[PDB]
Amino acid sequence: GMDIRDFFAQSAGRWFSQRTSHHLAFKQTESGKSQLTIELLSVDDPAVIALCQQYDMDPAWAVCGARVSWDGTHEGSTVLVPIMDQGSRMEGKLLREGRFSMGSDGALTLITEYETIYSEERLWFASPNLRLRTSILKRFGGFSMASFCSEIRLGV
Amino acid sequence: GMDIRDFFAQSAGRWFSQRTSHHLAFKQTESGKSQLTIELLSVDDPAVIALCQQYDMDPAWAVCGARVSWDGTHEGSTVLVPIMDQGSRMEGKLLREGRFSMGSDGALTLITEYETIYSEERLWFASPNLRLRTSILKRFGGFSMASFCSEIRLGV
């Protein structure tokens, strides 16, 4: 019964991420460990504002933001900012430095599609310290990748 | 918007299964390929009846059944039979040779818990020829396993 802002807040913190990807066509599989740092940003934060106008958007719509940093294979940091839909607290657009949807079950779904490339990710908490996510990648008329991630909260 | 019977019918067929499991506590991971054969059984089928009475159940409740066979590491075959809930076509009990729940999104959820061991699996179709499933295993007060499976329909 939580919304995006709640989901974003919950995600905040340091996590150990274990990723496994299945390459459908080649019946292969590659896995990789990684560290993740999710810090919730306030609508006031300059990073948020920058992204909004960047996407030609008004910061008055940004409900919150987040800075996701990783490390492990490659590494970096990106900022995400959700823009609400007409009178909605569950669906809208997600600005990346794509569309999102919060569901009754408390799981977030992200969808970004260009032309032949469709990407669908689903994130959810199995525990306040266990975030999981699945995803599929469709490309040139065929599914090409299916992935899973286990993220356990670190602490410190 | 499909129900169990529909989900069971859809699952029927031969599939190539790719499984990856993440062992949380030890930050490990093991993957394995496998073949799967799902044949839908009718309430009339003797295998179904046997299981019902076996679970001290009346075959008049069984909406359908299924024989799941696999191969690859270990191998075998088991039968599953869903028993409906009072005036319900989405939730109920699942007899294994545990509780189930069909959702609006068309994804099935299976839950079986003894005492300290909790098991939650979620199956769904990303395509009529792509069935996916995630799961978590809680044991002795701690999550111990998270898994993902990609199943692409074979044919023949």
From Swiss-Prot, chains A, B:
UniProt-listed InterPro entries: Calycin, CpcS/CpeS
EC id: 4.-.-.-
Signal peptide coordinates: none
Enzyme class: lyase
One MF term in the entry's GO annotations: lyase activity
Superkingdom: Bacteria
Keywords attached to this entry: Lyase
Any Pfam family hit: CpeS
Family: Belongs to the CpcS/CpeS biliprotein lyase family.
Function: Covalently attaches a chromophore to Cys residue(s) of phycobiliproteins.
Listed name of the protein: Chromophore lyase CpcS/CpeS
Organism: Thermosynechococcus vestitus (strain NIES-2133 / IAM M-273 / BP-1)
Organism phylogeny: Bacteria, Bacillati, Cyanobacteriota, Cyanophyceae, Acaryochloridales
